[PDB]
A = this chain, B = another copy of it.
Amino acid sequence: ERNIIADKYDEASVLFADIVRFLDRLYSAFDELVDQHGLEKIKVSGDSYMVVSGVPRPRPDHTQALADFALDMTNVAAQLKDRGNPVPLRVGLATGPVVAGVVGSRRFFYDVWGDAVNVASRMESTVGQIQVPDEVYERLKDDFVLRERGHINVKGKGVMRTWYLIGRKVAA
């Protein structure tokens, strides 16, 4: 069985960046630059930021293009002060032959199926509110405070009395 589909790109330029609510606004600004410059962000294991030029779409000006992007990048991080201090950004750029393409793996995660899953995920509307059916109310009433919402729609199921979960009771 084959798990890689990849090609040699003889001509390619690679960029890594890193810092040594604000950070997300910055990375959002970088994300916007990638798209503006027509480049490719690569998802990497870590906190580092990887951008690639000349791949998957070759271009003869791959190094210059990545260079312009990197300059705009540092420019963006310069303008954005945080504590009021500038962002300590490292940027590295290299150029040379690479291999690139798609790799097959498997994602493992927990899942659940049953009426309870449906009921929990298909109750209509509310905000900041926690809504629960009778079977949950009966289990929580002695140690928590709830107030009846009333009869609502659970899509795929029907109409259902529900309660808003307000808070815990202080132990008596």
Using a CB–CB distance below 8 Å, which chain A residues touch chain B? 4, 6, 12-18, 20-22, 24-25, 27-28, 31, 40-43, 48, 50, 52, 55-56, 63-64, 67-68, 70-71, 74, 77-78, 86, 88-133, 135-136, 139-140, 143-144, 165, 167-168
CA gap between A111 and B67 in the complex, in Å: 20
With A and B bound together, what is the CA distance between A88 and B129 in angstroms?
10
User: What are 22 contact pairs spanning A and B, CB under 8 A?
Assistant: A4-B111, A15-B120, A17-B124, A41-B110, A42-B111, A55-B110, A55-B112, A56-B110, A63-B136, A64-B144, A67-B136, A67-B140, A71-B167, A74-B129, A88-B127, A88-B128, A89-B128, A90-B127, A91-B130, A95-B136, A99-B114, A106-B107
Which residues from chain B contact A101 at a C-beta distance below 8 Å? 110-111
* Contact in complex: B132, A94 (CB < 8 Å): yes
Given known A92-B119, A103-B111, contact A21–B14 (CB-CB < 8 A): no
B107 contacts A105, C-beta separation under 8 Å: yes
Determine whether the beta carbon of A95 is less than 8 Å from that of B108: no
Give, as a whole number of angstroms, the nearest-CB distance from A158 to chain B. Answer: 14
Name the contact of A109 in the complex, choosing from B22, B43, B63 (C-beta under 8 A).
Answer: B43
Smallest CB gap from A18: residue in B: B124
Residues of B within 8 A of A140 (CB): 63-64, 67
A11 to B21, CA, bound (A): 32
**Nearest CB to that of A81 among chain B residues?**
B21
By CB atoms of chain B within 10 A, which of A20, A21, A27, A168 has the most? A21
Q: How far is the CA of A92 from the CA of B65 in the complex (A)?
A: 47
